[PDB]
Design a protein around this ligand. Structure first.
Ligand SMILES: Nc1cccc(-c2cn(-c3cccc(C(=O)O)c3C(=O)O)nn2)c1
Ligand SMILES: [Zn+2]
Ligand SMILES: [Zn+2]
Length: 231
């Protein structure tokens, strides 16, 4: 069973195996007075591992590297951050010092900089325009357009039919918007439509926070975002 927020002490990291060579990592962090869960992804890349997003903070991310060594043993060699917030780049300095090459789009790195957040080392090219995709080892990276943030990326594992939507996708139980201070509410439904046109056979959809499900997370997220708009 997928771990939930009350089951994970802040500072601990769970791994959840989704398919052969695909796991999610789950951690918790206090933010604005409450403790939230947060998801990232781990994708096997032959004798290496590709990491998607930190575990939200230097300490959680150190524990993430430890859990990966304990439970998988393959080396993390590259990391991608899917947007510029703490829950995606917080812990990038730990990844870098540990020898992980850290990547993000130029927009993400620039917004992280403006924000005073840790900054992935390398820019990802080819993701500047809505609908752009690029191959990155065992995954495709997709910029669906502005949504949760103007820079947010989604990650697809074609061999596993795993779509990692990051914080642009909500879990099914979520009935209100959440942190939208950096969102583009008007653009967000359109960006989700691009995701749906691109990955309609996704069998496992992972939100930035909370429980994975099926393709219905997409439409559901559109509904919640619009409802937040209309009031
Ligand atoms: N340094 C900085 C600046 C602004 C925002 C953040 C941040 C906000 N985070 C969130 C906390 C709880 C929930 C969510 C969500 O996706 O709904 C987020 C988020 O990613 O915005 N995570 N990092 C950090
Ligand atoms: Zn965010
Ligand atoms: Zn988030």
């Amino acid at each position: 069973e997928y771990p939930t927020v009350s089951e994970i002490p802040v500072g601990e990291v769970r791994l959840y195996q989704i398919a052969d060579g695909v796991w999610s990592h789950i951690a918790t962090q206090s933010f604005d007075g409450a403790v939230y869960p947060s998801n990232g992804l781990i994708v096997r890349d032959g004798d290496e591992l590709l990491l998607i997003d930190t575990a939200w903070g230097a300490k959680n991310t150190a524990a993430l590297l430890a859990e990966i060594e304990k439970q998988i043993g393959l080396p993390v060699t590259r990391a991608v951050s899917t947007h510029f917030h703490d829950d995606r780049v917080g812990g990038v300095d730990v990844l870098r010092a540990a020898g992980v090459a850290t990547y993000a789009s130029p927009s993400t790195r620039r917004l992280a900089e403006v924000e005073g957040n840790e900054i992935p080392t390398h820019s990802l090219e080819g993701l500047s325009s809505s609908g752009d995709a690029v191959r990155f080892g065992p995954v495709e990276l997709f910029y669906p357009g502005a949504a949760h943030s103007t820079d947010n990326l989604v990650v697809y594992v074609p061999s596993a039919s795993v779509l990692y939507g990051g914080c642009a996708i909500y879990e099914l139980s979520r009935t209100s918007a959440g942190n939208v201070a950096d969102a583009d509410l008007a653009e967000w439904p359109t960006s989700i439509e691009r995701i749906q046109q691109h990955y309609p056979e996704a069998q496992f959809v992972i939100p930035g926070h909370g429980l994975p499900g099926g393709l219905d997370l997409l439409k559901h997220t559109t509904n919640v975002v619009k409802a937040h708009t209309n009031r």
